[PDB]
């Protein structure tokens, strides 16, 4: 019924007209209060690669990412890349990846991810050295999907409580590309030089 | 009427019985959703210095702070102290400082702050090197109060949007004590050595 769904899937960019759909689908995945401005920006601003997967013409999945230089990484994740990667080095952050529950396990998520990788290759060549993202600790399904796709769990991010707001805990997950890697400790060097 | 209010003010620790009052007063200052567990912890856990100011026996102000080693500072604020301050160095973070609006400008906030400074001296001696806190960009009144009290604006903290949650923008404000200072740049050294 839905069994054949991948054969009826097309890829397109998000656009302003998609905002209400995007609110609905994102809200289903994640209980978080993004402002309208966030939705307008991700849907309409070319700084983002925002790609939808449609089934029978209706969005059933999306990936939203930003390719940016390493200085734009928030300090909590600054150490995803070693210091010997210069300030000009690029990374891609995945703001959102999701697929509608009924449509999961048909290969849509993988297709979206692959599409982003292709986009990175054409757009940034070998300059981009990591793709990174955040997952809630609770998301067993997502973690499995990413781990199976070579993403590594970089570190735990704790609950954050402040006047500015509250953040749930999470993990940063990173796929390294084009030779990227995290900072190396004394032992890491001892190993490479040693052996 | 309220004019004489400081003469009728007493200081006491927060306790479990205060939680509903604390929710009410904090909520009036800040629009943020702390979980019940946060309130239980700040009211009852001795890891925190949580001090209330009462007028006619009722809480009209409070300060909540935690004295902690520097490794416990979140990475966004790691650079409040220079690297030559060892890992054993302590800082105090102010989780909350507020006074009920009608009772403001009677000296209650200053008293709470001074009390924390006294607590730090007896508790940590000269080991604590900074007191730091966060304010929303919107808080003109708080900024004035802190700036007048020698706190410096260390840096801007941007809006944060993620699956984990949303944070409003803010500033980190720091008072240095016992010789504490931020990292020094090449020019900063050139100046000290130079002149
Ligand atoms: C993680 C997620 C995106 C995966 O999407 P999918 O669309 O489920 O991804 P895929 O279908 O490509 O892969 C899922 C599994 O199905 C398998 N699969 C793909 N097609 C299949 C098929 N036709 N028949 C059987 N299995 C299939 C894949 O091999 C994969 O298994 P593997 O990891 O063992 O290889 C999805 O679980 C999700 O949207 N979760 C919500 C995550 C979230 O909260 N994201 C951000 C919040 S805004
Ligand atoms: C910042 C804040 C705590 C200050 O409290 P206060 O109780 O107002 O502080 P004080 O009364 O000590 O000082 C306020 C001013 O009144 C002056 N003052 C004190 N007593 C006075 C008096 N009796 N007559 C006239 N002025 C007086 C003080 O000198 C000070 O002015 P200055 O900065 O020019 O010196 C208060 O504005 C507040 O609670 N703001 C909300 C901040 C917030 O959101 N905090 C965290 C959110 S959880």
Residue numbers in the entry:
A (entry chain A), B (entry chain A): 5 to 199
Q: Could you pull the original sentences from the published paper?
A:
The crystal structures of hNaa60(1-242)/Ac-CoA and hNaa60(1-199)/CoA were determined by molecular replacement and refined to 1.38 Å and 1.60 Å resolution, respectively. In the hNaa60(1-199)/CoA structure, a part of the α5-helix is deleted due to truncation of the C-terminal region. Interestingly, the remaining residues in α5-helix still form an amphipathic helix although the hydrophobic interaction with the N-terminal hydrophobic groove of a neighbor molecule is abolished and the helix is largely exposed in solvent due to different crystal packing. Upon removing the C-terminal region of hNaa60, we observed that hNaa60 (1-199) molecules pack in a different way involving the β7-β8 hairpin in the crystal, leading to about 50 degree rotation of the hairpin which moves away from the α1-α2 loop. Interestingly, in the hNaa60(1-199) crystal structure, the displaced β7-β8 hairpin opened a second way for the substrate to access the active center that would readily accommodate the binding of the H4 peptide, thus implied a potential explanation for KAT activity of this enzyme from a structural biological view. However, since hNaa60(1-242) and hNaa60(1-199) were crystallized in different crystal forms, the observed conformational change of the β7-β8 hairpin may simply be an artifact related to the different crystal packing. The electron density of Phe 34 side-chain is well defined in the hNaa60(1-242)/Ac-CoA structure, but becomes invisible in the hNaa60(1-199)/CoA structure, indicating displacement of the Phe 34 side-chain in the latter. Interestingly, in the structure of hNaa60(1-199)/CoA, the terminal thiol of CoA adopts alternative conformations. One is to approach the substrate amine (as indicated by the superimposed hNaa50/CoA/peptide structure), similar to the terminal ethanethioate of Ac-CoA in the structure of hNaa60(1-242)/Ac-CoA; the other is to approach the α1-α2 loop and away from the substrate amine.
As the first N-terminal acetyltransferase discovered on an organelle, NatF, encoded by NAA60 and also named as Histone acetyltransferase type B protein 4 (HAT4), Naa60 or N-acetyltransferase 15 (NAT15), is the youngest member of the NAT family. As an N-terminal acetyltransferase, NatF can specifically catalyze acetylation of the N-terminal α-amine of most transmembrane proteins and has substrate preference towards proteins with Met-Lys-, Met-Val-, Met-Ala- and Met-Met-N-termini, thus partially overlapping substrate selectivity with NatC and NatE18. Another important feature of NatF is that this protein is anchored on the Golgi apparatus through its C-terminal membrane-integrating region and takes part in the maintaining of Golgi integrity. The structure of hNaa60 protein contains a central domain exhibiting a classic GCN5-related N-acetyltransferase (GNAT) folding, along with the extended N- and C-terminal regions.
